[PDB]
Amino acid sequence: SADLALGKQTFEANCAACHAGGNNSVIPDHTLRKAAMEQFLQGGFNLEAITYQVENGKGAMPAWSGTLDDDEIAAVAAYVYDQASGDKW
Amino acid sequence: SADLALGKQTFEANCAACHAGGNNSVIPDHTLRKAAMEQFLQGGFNLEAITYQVENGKGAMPAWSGTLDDDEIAAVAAYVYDQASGDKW
Ligand code: HEM
Ligand code: HEM
């Protein structure tokens, strides 16, 4: 299913630098919150969209394929998704 | 067994700050290599000694029992142990 522990640690080790607190320090309005994603994430607010962006990157956001493994990409995507849907940031 | 992927991400998120590359930026000779640990780690170079220090801390090194859960502690201890034994640092 979803290893949110692996998710959280992967998030801290690789994403926190630009997305601490569910925010976006590079492009301020493209945060990791539900609303923002529903509006800016290509593919919609769903696990598929998040995973695809993590794998391939987007603009100033780097690609994580070949850096993270599918388990790590999957867990971090679930973590981001769960934090967002639950308003947990 | 302890998941080494979780171990790697836990190490990066929480330990890399002072132990990047298996080194020690605070007390230079107290590195994460087998020899160093054989000499300085209470209990000698073994998985259990590593786990105990991570849980409890030592001097300037903080304790992690609050910050990390048992699976993350077990995983990071295994990762550090495997890196040192294979001289992978
Ligand atoms: C870590 C592996 C990581 C994750 C997870 C992550 C997620 C992510 C999402 C879901 C978005 C979409 C948000 C939205 O409202 O559309 C997104 C967007 C951007 N990110 Fe990211 N991101 C991760 C890592 C990083 C890192 C390391 C940086 C900084 C160098 C970063 C930056 C950005 C930027 C910029 C965007 C917007 C991309 C665009 O639409 O142009 N992310 N990220
Ligand atoms: C992350 C959770 C983490 C781990 C793993 C870790 C391991 C570790 C070991 C096994 C030793 C012993 C090395 C030896 O040769 O004896 C050790 C020692 C020290 N560490 Fe550490 N460490 C982790 C995290 C941190 C962090 C974030 C810092 C810096 C703030 C830090 C620093 C130190 C220091 C200093 C020591 C020496 C302790 C002493 O004997 O006086 N560690 N670490």
Side-chain angles (χ1 to χ4, degrees):
Chain A
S1 312
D3 189 4
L4 295 181
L6 175 63
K8 180 172 163 71
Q9 300 301 127
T10 293
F11 184 84
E12 293 180 357
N14 309 99
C15 326
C18 305
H19 296 293
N23 292 316
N24 195 322
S25 57
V26 183
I27 301 292
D29 66 342
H30 287 222
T31 59
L32 299 195
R33 307 211 166 77
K34 192 185 195 304
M37 281 185 285
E38 297 202 282
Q39 183 187 349
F40 306 119
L41 180 57
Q42 173 204 331
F45 178 50
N46 51 69
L47 197 38
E48 263 306 272
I50 297 168
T51 304
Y52 191 70
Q53 185 139 314
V54 174
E55 298 175 322
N56 307 290
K58 189 69 191 175
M61 179 165 149
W64 298 94
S65 299
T67 299
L68 302 179
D69 75 25
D70 37 274
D71 299 306
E72 296 167 335
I73 287 170
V76 78
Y79 175 72
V80 166
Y81 183 86
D82 174 76
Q83 291 287 282
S85 63
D87 295 32
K88 302 170 182 177
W89 295 109
Chain B
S1 201
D3 172 18
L4 293 184
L6 176 64
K8 189 184 175 189
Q9 296 306 120
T10 291
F11 181 85
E12 292 175 0
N14 311 93
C15 326
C18 304
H19 297 292
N23 295 309
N24 193 326
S25 53
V26 182
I27 301 179
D29 71 336
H30 281 42
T31 63
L32 298 201
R33 303 202 162 79
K34 74 231 282 184
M37 288 190 268
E38 284 166 24
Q39 188 185 346
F40 308 125
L41 179 60
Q42 178 197 336
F45 177 58
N46 54 89
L47 183 80
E48 304 79 21
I50 293 171
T51 301
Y52 191 80
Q53 183 145 315
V54 170
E55 298 172 321
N56 306 291
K58 175 74 167 248
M61 177 168 142
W64 300 88
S65 311
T67 305
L68 312 172
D69 69 13
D70 295 57
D71 286 337
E72 294 167 340
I73 286 177
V76 77
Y79 174 82
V80 171
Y81 182 87
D82 296 352
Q83 294 288 284
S85 62
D87 291 283
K88 291 242 288 161
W89 291 125

